Design an enzyme around this catalytic site. Structure first.
Site, PDB file in Angstrom:
ATOM      1  N   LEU A  22       0.925  -1.061  -0.433  1.00 14.62           N
ATOM      2  CA  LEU A  22      -0.165   0.060  -0.188  1.00 14.62           C
ATOM      3  C   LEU A  22       0.559   1.472  -0.126  1.00 14.62           C
ATOM      4  O   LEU A  22       2.081   0.863   0.581  1.00 14.62           O
ATOM      5  CB  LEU A  22      -0.939  -0.324   1.402  1.00 14.62           C
ATOM      6  CG  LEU A  22      -1.938  -1.174   1.340  1.00 14.62           C
ATOM      7  CD1 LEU A  22      -3.397  -1.631   2.384  1.00 14.62           C
ATOM      8  CD2 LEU A  22      -2.939  -1.171  -0.808  1.00 14.62           C
ATOM      9  N   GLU A  30      -9.636   1.713   8.280  1.00 18.66           N
ATOM     10  CA  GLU A  30      -9.910   1.449   6.854  1.00 18.66           C
ATOM     11  C   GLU A  30      -9.736   0.435   6.611  1.00 18.66           C
ATOM     12  O   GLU A  30     -10.656  -0.532   5.454  1.00 18.66           O
ATOM     13  CB  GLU A  30      -8.800   2.307   5.857  1.00 18.66           C
ATOM     14  CG  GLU A  30      -9.184   1.999   5.345  1.00 18.66           C
ATOM     15  CD  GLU A  30      -9.606   1.591   3.591  1.00 18.66           C
ATOM     16  OE1 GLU A  30     -11.003   2.058   3.142  1.00 18.66           O
ATOM     17  OE2 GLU A  30      -8.570   0.942   3.363  1.00 18.66           O
TER      18      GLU A  30
END
Ligand SMILES: NC(=O)C1=CN([C@@H]2O[C@H](COP(=O)(O)OP(=O)(O)OC[C@H]3O[C@@H](n4cnc5c(N)ncnc54)[C@H](OP(=O)(O)O)[C@@H]3O)[C@@H](O)[C@H]2O)C=CC1
Ligand SMILES: CCc1nc(N)nc(N)c1C#C[C@H](C)c1cc(OC)cc(-c2ccc(C(=O)O)cc2)c1
Ligand SMILES: [Cl-]
Length: 186
Positions: A22, A30
């Site tokens: 990421l 999240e």
């Protein structure tokens, strides 16, 4: 099988990946959002199906593959058998979707979730029919080498609210973001 859905977390510069990770530091809630949305079946006795590309599959920590509580399916024209941990392997998104009509997946599957990456999103977004896009807008730029395709605002409508989803700004580790849901019909 129930509805067809995409889910993604995207940076301001439309980034979704970087060196197989990421682009941002881990956002605990999240992630929880992602987990709960893709894992929660609306039908008792059924599981959701998550569909991902090969790079997305291998970017997941080995200790967490397959994604728990969900039927995992990987897309690849190169692999000959599902990778270790995976149940299913299709050549393309459409093969995968048609595979959900077969007895061994029908009955068994509730919702379908596309969870990455870029190419799979592209295909899904343009697929004809009822489609929902769950987009987390991370409100800042991160250096990224993979990207989320622009949403065709002529096909997709942005919902003001979606049931069970908070509309207001979130913040973890200094980073603000918002949960969005888009809808279309063909
Ligand atoms: N933040 C988010 O919401 C998301 C983040 N990510 C990040 O995105 C990055 C990887 O996503 P991406 O880079 O797009 O790699 P993908 O997950 O798209 O997988 C790419 C590879 O999988 C196969 N593949 C992908 N799409 C298809 C298809 N439609 N049909 C057949 N085979 C396909 C191809 O290999 P072959 O030659 O074998 O077909 C392709 O090279 C990672 O860094 C990951 O962390 C992942 C998902 C979403
Ligand atoms: C949580 C991130 C995320 N948010 C949203 N809104 N949509 C998505 N599609 C993904 C995603 C993703 C892919 C599947 C992904 C990429 C990745 O790069 C490292 C890691 C994970 C991942 C999966 C499971 C676990 C775990 O169970 O601990 C940890 C990381 C999962
Ligand atoms: Cl939880």
């Amino acid at each position: 099988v129930g509805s067809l859905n995409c889910i993604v977390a995207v940076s301001q510069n439309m980034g979704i990946g970087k060196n197989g990770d990421l682009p941002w530091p881990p956002l605990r809630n999240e992630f929880r959002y992602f987990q709960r949305m893709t894992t929660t079946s609306s039908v008792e006795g059924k599981q959701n199906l998550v569909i991902m590309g090969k790079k997305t599959w291998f970017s997941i920590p080995e200790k967490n593959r397959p994604l728990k509580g969900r039927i995992n399916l990987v897309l690849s024209r190169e692999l000959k058998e599902p990778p270790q941990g995976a149940h299913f392997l299709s050549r393309s998104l459409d093969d995968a979707l048609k595979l959900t009509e077969q007895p061994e997946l029908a009955n068994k599957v509730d919702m379908v979730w596309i969870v990455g990456g870029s190419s799979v999103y592209k295909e899904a977004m343009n697929h004809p029919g009822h489609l929902k896009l769950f987009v987390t807008r991370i409100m800042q730029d991160f250096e990224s080498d993979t990207f989320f395709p622009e949403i065709d605002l002529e096909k997709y409508k942005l919902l003001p609210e979606y049931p069970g989803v908070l509309s207001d700004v979130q913040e973890e580790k200094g980073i603000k973001y918002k949960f969005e849901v888009y809808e279309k019909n063909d």
